[PDB]
């Protein structure tokens, strides 16, 4: 009984990158052993969130009554090598027939724009619904390009606007924009530029960054160009690269603005010397409580490729305290698809009476239901009409203290709360 598999009357896919590995040349046409790679505690947590959402719905006589939900889940540390599990979800009796009812009715994920751009075209072809809990690339709002694509996090445009709100709420107008050397980081660069062109904000420096960036010289330029505001648009790995290198190089008295991919990071706030590099601000997904997840995790800590975690002797409380961002996006993803299937079978809420994944797609678009008192819907592009951003400040207790908030159709900041280094 694997964590990655679970039988059911209808299968939903699950795309996660639980492990990390930098890209590397390969001479053979075969999957990667991700299990022997670098574990990611926050991703495995989102991983578990999917498993919890399916179990919770399976526990319900209200949503999909007497219709079990199953799943095939994957750990795709490399987007290049994800296709075998992709082929799994889209196959009919493990055959792919390119010219023509598949194993799965839809898929939750992937996390990464890069994972998404690599595989989404194959999904779109038959209007096979993908619901991403993470991909923020603004190219995904173009619905002709990605017709069966939807998501539960906002576009980069929105987050970039919030970041710019933060910048404008203060007095600094030269900025460094450090961004990850992938499609996510790049899109962020594009959107940031697009947003500040007609503005007192002057982009004074930028650079694609990776784990092997000469951070020593990136920071001399930034200093000699006297920049105090350093926006870092990057996910966990790249974020820790920047910030950790910032402490090792007496980078000091800067204002760092985080995006929601590292503003609730847990390694960096508790790190020795972090307070010496200035002050950390960011937009964050506001922590949403998911009743019952805690008990679930305690219960869980207790083959085909990329379906092995290799993660025993894992601390239950490490897991629970890991960066909780993207929780509700995963939560609302699974529930979104479940509701869409519930309505395509035309279930009541007592019982349910052939499901093509595109039939799931039309109900997915029409999504309208409550979840933890949030309304879950999408616009005609597939972008979510729910979620907000809080403005946090990293304080002396290692906490991302909430000091303001942003709402996508309406920023406010209580500046006294920020204690500047």
């Amino acid at each position, epitope marked *: 009984t694997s964590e990655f598999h679970l039988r059911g009357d209808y299968l939903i896919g699950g795309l996660f990158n639980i492990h990390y590995v930098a890209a590397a040349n390969f001479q053979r046409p075969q999957a990667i052993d991700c299990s022997s790679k670098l574990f990611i505690l926050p991703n495995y947590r989102r991983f578990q969130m999917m498993r919890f959402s399916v179990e919770e719905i399976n526990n319900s006589s209200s949503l999909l009554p007497n219709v079990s939900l199953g799943y095939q889940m994957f750990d795709h540390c490399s987007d290049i090598h994800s296709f075998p599990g992709i082929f799994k979800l889209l196959s009919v009796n493990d055959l792919i027939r390119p010219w023509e009812l598949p194993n799965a009715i839809g898929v939750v994920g992937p996390f990464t724009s890069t994972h998404a751009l690599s595989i989404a075209p194959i999904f779109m072809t038959n209007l096979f619904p993908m619901v991403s809990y993470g991909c923020s690339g603004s190219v995904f709002s173009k619905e002709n390009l990605y017709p069966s694509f939807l998501r539960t996090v906002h576009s980069n445009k929105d987050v970039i606007n919030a970041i710019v*709100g933060i910048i*404008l*709420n203060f*007095n*600094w*107008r*030269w900025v460094a924009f450090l961004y990850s050397d992938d499609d996510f980081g790049k899109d962020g660069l594009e959107q940031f530029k697009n947003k*500040i062109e*007609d*503005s*007192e*904000i*002057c982009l004074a420096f930028y650079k694609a960054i990776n784990v092997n960036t000469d951070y020593l010289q990136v920071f001399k330029q930034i200093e*000699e*160009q*006297n920049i*105090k505001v350093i926006v870092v648009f990057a996910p966990k790995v790249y974020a820790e690269a920047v910030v950790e290198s910032a402490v090792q190089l007496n980078v000091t008295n800067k204002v760092w603005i985080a995006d929601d991919g590292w503003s609730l990071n847990k390694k960096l706030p508790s790190m020795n010397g972090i307070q010496n590099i200035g002050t950390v601000l960011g937009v964050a997904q506001p922590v949403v409580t998911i009743p019952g997840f805690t008990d679930f995790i305690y219960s869980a800590i207790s083959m085909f490729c990329n379906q092995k975690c290799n993660c025993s002797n894992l601390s239950v409380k490490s897991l629970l305290n890991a960066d909780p961002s993207f929780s509700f996006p995963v939560y609302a993803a699974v529930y979104a698809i479940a509701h869409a299937l519930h309505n395509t079978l035309r279930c009541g809420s007592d019982r349910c009476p052939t499901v093509h994944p595109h039939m799931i797609l039309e109900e997915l678009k029409k999504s309208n239901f409550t979840l933890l008192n949030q309304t879950v819907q999408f616009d005609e592009n597939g972008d979510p009409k729910f979620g907000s951003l809080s403005v946090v400040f990293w304080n002396s207790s290692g906490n991302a203290e909430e000091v303001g908030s942003y709402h996508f159709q309406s*920023l406010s900041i209580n500046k006294t709360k920020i204690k500047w280094f």
Partner: antibody
Amino acid sequence: EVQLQQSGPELVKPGASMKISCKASGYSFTGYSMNWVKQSHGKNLEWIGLINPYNGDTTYKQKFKGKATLTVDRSSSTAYMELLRLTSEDSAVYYCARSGRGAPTTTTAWFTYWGQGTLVTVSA
Amino acid sequence: DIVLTQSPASLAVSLGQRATISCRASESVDSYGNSFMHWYQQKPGQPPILLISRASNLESGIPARFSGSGSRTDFTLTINPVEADDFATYYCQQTNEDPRTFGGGTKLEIKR
């Protein structure tokens, strides 16, 4: 074209109040500080203050605190400056001026676009 | 508050010759690797036009016969050659620190 259009000249009584407007067009209103400048006859430029049209934060030169109030209306892209308890010393020309792009702080910003100006005449 | 003292207060320059206007600040107006001293031209009845920003950066649309230099507390505007419509008051302006302050102005007359 960026334009800053101000109110016509005003004749206003001593000890009364008046509000000068600066309709902005041709750029994104909230992206730049709007500044105000007094010039007496006896030509000297004097900075009254600025406002951030994004959040309404204001900054003033000391001698104009309690004498000037800068506001904005984002639905009309207008900056306002209300003058209070007017004496003949407030008889001057007032300019609204937008900050430029290129400065490192909102404070260091210089003035690239100017209103045509508003003559204020304080008299009974 | 930084005092800017311009000299001379008044100046008449024949056509095609050189005008050198100076501005002295009470404190340095250097910061961020720059000098926040700017030059404005105000013609009679008009708003000031920004000629030069940050001590020496010529602004769009302003002829290269206008130029400036200086740093810290000593700055100069030069007009070379002078032309017939350059009579105006020329103001320097610091924006290094709050509040912004202006020099008392130099009035350039065309000498003929």
